Design a protein that fits this description.
Two copies of one chain form a homodimer. Chain A is built from twelve helices and 17 strands. In chain A, strands 3, 4, 5, 8, 9, 10, 11, 12 and 13 form a nine-stranded mixed sheet that branches. A six-stranded mixed sheet of chain A has the order 6-2-1-7-16-15, sandwiched between helices. Chain A is an alpha/beta fold. The first copy, chain A, folds into three domains: 215 residues, no CATH class; 144 residues, no CATH class; 52 residues, no CATH class. Chain A is globular, with a radius of gyration of 21 Å. At the A-B interface, helix 8, helix 9, helix 11 and helix 12 of A face helix 8, helix 9, helix 11 and helix 12 of B. The complex binds flavin-adenine dinucleotide (2 copies) and phenylsulfinylmethylbenzene (IKF) (4 copies). Chains A, B: Pfam families: Smoa_sbd (PF17885). Chains A, B: This is Putative dehydrogenase/oxygenase subunit (Flavoprotein). Chains A, B: Keywords: FAD, Flavoprotein, Nucleotide-binding.
């Protein structure tokens, strides 16, 4: 009934807090102080859809639900190749229930505070193998929940579940104040720039209050792979506006008076999508279990990492509670991951990895048809809450045409 | 905020009770009295796994949880072709959480009583088109939850989702007292008789207390398609013992003193697996929405119909609550079904329909390997709680060999 978790992030803290509430003793390692997280760089755009939000609600952890702006739909626009400044696709659909984006700079430090208040043992150290060897002698189970930290590479890359070994997009985030609110409802406003990349923007809550988060993804080497020469926050804001002016002038109209929320409300980087084997064996021969981004890491193009992290921690918590006094051996660890992967994450991952590649004709047809077939637009919007619902019609041309027909018949 | 439901069965009553608890007005049509259901023929073997049981718990509807025997694992046996009376495969695995089988003869009438007590309007009539036309003028939404009743055929068969148009098994149930309990834990004891059929048995709760339910499925025309000449309860019990004596003598050893729980604790029949389109249009042009077995009907070989019914009613209830004052139009109806189908039921249905066909070599290899690889046996057992977790390794030979390797590595 003693659990150790290395890494104080979304999944690790959600799990630790749920374990404490169930009467477990929990040790957690953090490599940063709460205040340094609050005031440091942004980490995510963390748009969480209703199913993930509800996992938090059910643990009593939705502390910002009233203050965080709701995200009430999804929109998709595509520039018109033959009409300057216009869109050839431009539609939106309401989400059946609101999404919300609460800055991890707010959430993770507040959850660290709650974790201590509820009796967790928070240990401050940049943990390595030595700490894992110690934890595995004093605890019944040790999890690594370290996200994109270097220690995550202790787990073996799963080549068969990882089609990519290089970054597929150049990423940037810009948190801003002063953006014209979307009317008549808020949305994830997605912009697909063929052969170039993607821009998405939606309202969120950060450390200085409500904002909007601009999310940029660029095909590497293309016109939106444009962050290498950006060296200051001012240059970052300027490059953000330049992208909108150049590729999505309809969005630039909302941005005449935007400012950064704070100089650390910016990010640029890239990584290869990666799936890893969940059980790592230490030099001693003892074993540790990987959680969330340690074992399933996706590009943010589908906005699923934090959703995955909440759903992964829920599955792992349920598995721990069901195990009782049973051994937390490698078999149990593997079966816990397997339920997450085969039951859910394989479909999130396959969908995301397909979207990173150039869209085949049947996908462009789906995106266009959604603008004239509102049930299909709704299927797209609410698929973000459970990407299993995209299969098999998103990936297969013949199935896509059947689903368009089903949607048109009830429009 | 007025909902009508035609058919007082598992899904219809679960949904109606959840709607009443959320403040809706609910009208329900039943074609039988509660007492006639209690004392009539059995309808199911209704083995419900933990996720389905939890849906009921969360609605406060688990009224028999303490009295119903738990089912704590799954076992699989296959007769040895070259050793008389022996098994070439014989293994078991524990379920991570208990399953339970509460006779629908107990549950449905008790839930009808609760439905009235909680303010539902229970109307007694064999409902037809006229009642649906009336309901759709006086209610905001009308659902058909009539199971295998004739009115279910109002919904159009979905040929593309229905690979079969004929029964694939001859079915029978026998509820008995006096069976030797399984030691050291209870289980769904499955017996696969190659080219002949399947026998499964597990403990349950019926109207005279704890029992075991014998479940027989026979390839049509084969040795276990053997119920046509059975005309009395005594002949039914005798034919049940004959199957065990002939094909599974190890199970017959537990059955030396079995008796029927009651003369109506028997069933024999068959049906074609069928998927239907969820929106039916009445002569008036008004529309009704199908629920559970009306739109997704599977053979019982995987024991999923009641599980599907609980999960379907949960999805539909969530969709209704999220809709608020939004129109309950055909688009919303279709999207509600689509989330159930693409998110979940398509995988239950594909798995079940594959199992009805003769097993390919890689499946026989999986079943044999599970006897020597306990993590793989556990994957099989707990897959019954969420059949999504069988994909893609159950259906594809190359993926099956990868998963066997994953399991063996942590054994
Ligand atoms: C640009 C960007 C945009 C995104 N947008 C979205 C979005 O809109 N929606 C969405 O759902 N997801 C989004 N994500 C993904 C989401 O942010 C992550 O998937 C989520 O944070 C995963 O949670 P986790 O618990 O696995 O890791 P994290 O929350 O990253 O936590 C890991 C923690 O462990 C710490 N750590 C690392 N190494 C060690 C060590 N050795 N010892 C101790 N601590 C250590 C790290 O510092 C970090 O604090 C986005 C990601 C990026 C990069
Ligand atoms: C032999 C057998 C064994 C099974 N074993 C299992 C098992 O182990 N595990 C499992 O999970 N599932 C099992 N099932 C499946 C499970 O019993 C059903 O899938 C489940 O009952 C579906 O619930 P439902 O609400 O859709 O329909 P039901 O529970 O069948 O309810 C439909 C109700 O509507 C009534 N009705 C019909 N027509 C009308 C009308 N015109 N007006 C009013 N009322 C009407 C019917 O009389 C019935 O009472 C089994 C099924 C069979 C046949
Ligand atoms: O992370 S962005 C995905 C993206 C889109 C466009 C340009 C960059 C990134 C997101 C967030 C929530 C829901 C959907 C998308
Ligand atoms: O309905 S039986 C399936 C079956 C097996 C063997 C012979 C007949 C039928 C069941 C119940 C719960 C879980 C698994 C199987
Ligand atoms: O990839 S296309 C457009 C796009 C996707 C994600 C972020 C930005 C743009 C898509 C759009 C909606 C639903 C599924 C896929
Ligand atoms: O169809 S085979 C054997 C069998 C299945 C179902 C009812 C009786 C026997 C199987 C066994 C376990 C898990 C998946 C498939």
């Amino acid at each position: 009934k003693r659990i150790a978790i290395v890494g104080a992030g979304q999944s690790g803290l959600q799990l630790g807090l749920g374990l404490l509430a169930a009467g477990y003793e929990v040790t957690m390692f953090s490599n940063r102080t709460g205040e340094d997280i609050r005031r440091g760089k942004v980490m995510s755009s963390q748009c969480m859809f209703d199913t993930s939000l509800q996992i938090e609600r059910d643990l009593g952890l939705d502390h910002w639900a009233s203050d965080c702006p709701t995200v009430d739909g999804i929109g998709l626009a595509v520039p018109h190749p033959e009409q300057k400044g216009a869109k050839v696709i431009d539609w939106a659909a309401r989400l059946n229930a609101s999404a919300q984006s609460v800055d991890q700079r707010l959430k993770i430090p507040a959850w660290m505070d709650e974790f201590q208040k509820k009796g967790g043992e928070l240990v401050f150290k940049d943990a390595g193998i030595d700490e894992l060897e110690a934890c595995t002698q004093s605890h019944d189970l040790t999890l690594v929940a370290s996200g994109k930290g270097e220690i995550s590479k202790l787990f073996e890359r799963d080549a068969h579940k990882s089609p990519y070994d290089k970054p597929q997009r150049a990423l940037a985030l810009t948190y801003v104040k002063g953006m014209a609110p979307r009317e008549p409802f808020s949305a994830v406003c997605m912009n697909l720039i063929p052969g170039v990349g993607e821009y998405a923007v939606f309202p969120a809550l950060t450390t200085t209050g409500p904002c909007e988060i601009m999310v940029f993804e660029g095909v590497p080497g293309g016109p939106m792979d444009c962050w290498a020469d950006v060296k200051t926050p001012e240059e970052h804001l300027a490059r953000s506006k330049w992208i909108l002016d150049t590729f999505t002038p309809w969005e630039a109209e909302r941005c005449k008076d935007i400012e950064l929320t704070d100089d650390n409300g910016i990010l640029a980087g890239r990584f290869a999508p990666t799936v890893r084997k969940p059980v790592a064996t230490l030099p001693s021969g003892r074993k540790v279990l990987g959680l969330a981004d340690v074992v399933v890491l996706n590009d943010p193009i589908t906005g699923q990492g934090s959703n995955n992290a909440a759903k992964c921690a829920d599955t792992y918590l349920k598995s721990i509670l069901a195990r009782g006094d049973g051994a937390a051996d490698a078999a149990w660890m593997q079966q816990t991951f397997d339920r997450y992967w085969f039951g859910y994450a394989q479909w999130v991952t396959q969908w995301t990895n397909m979207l990173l590649a150039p869209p085949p004709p049947h996908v462009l047809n789906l995106l266009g048809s959604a603008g004239a077939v509102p049930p299909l637009a709704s299927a797209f919007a609410n698929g973000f809450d459970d990407p299993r619902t995209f299969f098999p019609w998103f990936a297969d041309a013949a199935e896509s045409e059947r689903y368009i027909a089903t949607c048109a018949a009830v429009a």
